[PDB]
């Protein structure tokens, strides 16, 4: 029995794209210093310890 028609489904077309970038970053070596942050609104007063990793 020859099949003139078959369930070929929908004609769905799928596209793929890729994006490449190269960046150069300069980061300073900050000291580890304790800074006082005042309370404001919902934020309570807290001590802050900075770190040099960007």
């Amino acid at each position: 029995a020859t099949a003139i028609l078959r369930p070929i489904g929908l004609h769905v077309e799928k596209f793929q794209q890729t994006y490449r970038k190269k960046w150069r970053f300069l980061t300073s070596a900050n000291a580890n210093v304790i800074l006082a942050e005042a309370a404001s609104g919902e934020r309570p007063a807290r001590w802050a310890l900075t770190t040099g990793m960007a």
């Binding site: 304790i34 006082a36 001590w47």
Partner: protein, 54 residues
């Protein structure tokens, strides 16, 4: 210097915890050799000087 102050201390911002930051800690206690001071000694004197600690 190693473990910081308590959060309620006023000097809390002075010394951040080294155990948390990974910073260094200047050592200030050094070895000292001793010998007798014979200038004020009356009678017999010991004039041996310093031992060769090197």
């Amino acid at each position: 210097a190693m473990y910081g102050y308590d959060n309620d201390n006023k000097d809390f911002a002075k010394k951040p915890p080294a155990d948390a930051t990974g910073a260094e800690i200047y050592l200030q206690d050094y070895l000292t050799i001793y010998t007798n001071d014979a200038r004020a000694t009356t009678g017999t004197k010991i004039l041996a000087g310093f031992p060769p600690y090197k």
